[PDB]
Write a structure and sequence with these properties.
By secondary structure, the chain is mainly alpha-helical. It has five helices and three strands. This is DNA-directed RNA polymerase subunit beta'.
């Protein structure tokens, strides 16, 4: 696991307003997609169940198609929610970033590296302990 060896408090504070803005906009951009994908899928559902209404319809057949559509929609929302939870995790970890903290998640650390990598430093192994 990685460890936070150093953090720049001034730089984090001075530019905090801007990061918080860019963060919410990205989080909102994901939210717009979620709702946009769900409505298109629900319109597809209503269209498909309508074909079955025009065609021959069985109360049990339509239900499994219905049940199948609700399942796909639940998959779409759950995946979008995971993306949001990860995004909130990135921001929370960054604001509360402090030396001696532990970042066990590989993807999270390098996400903190690409964006915000200039505000802090981290390492692994005895090299990191020597720094602390």
């Amino acid at each position: 696991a990685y460890v936070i060896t150093s953090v720049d408090d001034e730089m984090r504070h001075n530019e905090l307003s801007t990061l918080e803005a860019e963060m919410a906009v990205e989080k909102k951009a994901v939210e717009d997609q979620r709702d946009a994908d769900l409505e298109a899928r629900a319109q597809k559902l209503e269209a498909d169940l309508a074909e079955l209404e025009a065609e021959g319809a069985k109360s049990d057949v339509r239900r499994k198609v219905r049940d199948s559509g609700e399942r796909e929609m639940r998959q779409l929302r759950d995946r979008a929610q995971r993306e949001l939870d990860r995004l909130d995790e990135i921001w929370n970890t960054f604001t509360k970033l402090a030396p001696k903290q532990l970042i066990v998640d590989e993807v999270l650390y390098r996400e903190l590296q690409d964006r915000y990598g200039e505000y802090f430093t981290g390492a692994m192994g005895a090299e990191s302990i020597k720094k602390l």
